[PDB]
Design a protein around this ligand. Structure first.
Ligand SMILES: *[C@@H]1O[C@H](CO)[C@@H](O)[C@H](O)[C@H]1NC(C)=O
Ligand SMILES: [Cu+2]
Length: 193
C-alpha cells in the first residue's frame, strides 16, 4: 500500500494506496469516477533532466521492482500504448525486508529518479509508475501523472491482473530496456512469470 508523490498524480485527492483490482477491471491507472484531473501545477521535465520519483506510505512489502512508462494518451485506457523509460529491479519503493514506520501518509525516505531520454519528442504525456511488491499477495500497483516534456522503447510489463509473479523475489522484467537500475538486496533478485 503505497502511492506516487512526485510527479504529482492525476486526481490525487481520490487516489488511494490500494493495488489494481485483481480482475484487471481498473487497469490502467486505477480507473474510477473523475480519475484524470490534472494537478494545478504543471510538471515539466526537460529532456536529459534528472527528475524526482518519490512515494507516500509505509506498507512497502519488502520492496520489489518498478517501471516508469509514458503514453501519449492523456486519459489512458486498456488500448493505450506505453513506452518504458526506466526499470528498477529490486529495492523499489524501498530496500527493507518488510514494511516501514509511519502509517499511510508518511513520506517514504527512499527516493528515486528518472530522466526523459533523447528519443522522446517534446509534448504532453501520461507517466505511469508500476510496482510489483516482493512480499504478500501477488499484486500490481499503478499510479499515473500528467507531464510535459520540453526540449531543454519496450512495452510496459503487466502481471498479477495469467502472468503471475513469485512471492519473495524482486522480479527482473523480460524486456526492461536500456536504463535498468538494481536497488535491492542481491539475495532477493530473481534467479518473471
Ligand atoms: C538516481 O537514483 C539512483 C538510485 O538511488 C542513483 O544511483 C543515481 O545516482 C541517481 N541519479 C542522480 C542523483 O542523478
Ligand atoms: Cu499493501
Amino acid at each position: 500500500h503505497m502511492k506516487m508523490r512526485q510527479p504529482t498524480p492525476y486526481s490525487d485527492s481520490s487516489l488511494n494506496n490500494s493495488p489494481l483490482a485483481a480482475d484487471g477491471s481498473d487497469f490502467p491507472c486505477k480507473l474510477r469516477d473523475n480519475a484524470f484531473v490534472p494537478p494545478s501545477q504543471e510538471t515539466i521535465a526537460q529532456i536529459g533532466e534528472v527528475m524526482p520519483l518519490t512515494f507516500t506510505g509505509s506498507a512497502t512489502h519488502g520492496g520489489g521492482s518498478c517501471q516508469v512508462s509514458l503514453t501519449t494518451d492523456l486519459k489512458p485506457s486498456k488500448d493505450s500504448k506505453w513506452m518504458v523509460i526506466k526499470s528498477i529491479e529490486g529495492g523499489c519503493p524501498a530496500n527493507v525486508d518488510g514494511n516501514m514506520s509511519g502509517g499511510a501518509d508518511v513520506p517514504d525516505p527512499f527516493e528515486f529518479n528518472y530522466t526523459i531520454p533523447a528519443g522522446i519528442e517534446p509534448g504532453k504525456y501520461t507517466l505511469a509508475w508500476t510496482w510489483f511488491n516482493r512480499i504478500g499477495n501477488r499484486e500490481m500497483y499503478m499510479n499515473c501523472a500528467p507531464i510535459t516534456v520540453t526540449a531543454g522503447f519496450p512495452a510496459m510489463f503487466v502481471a498479477n491482473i495469467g502472468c503471475t509473479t513469485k512471492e519473495g523475489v524482486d522480479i527482473r522484467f523480460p524486456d526492461p530496456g536500456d536504463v535498468v537500475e538494481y536497488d535491492g538486496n542481491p539475495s532477493n533478485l530473481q534467479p518473471a512469470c
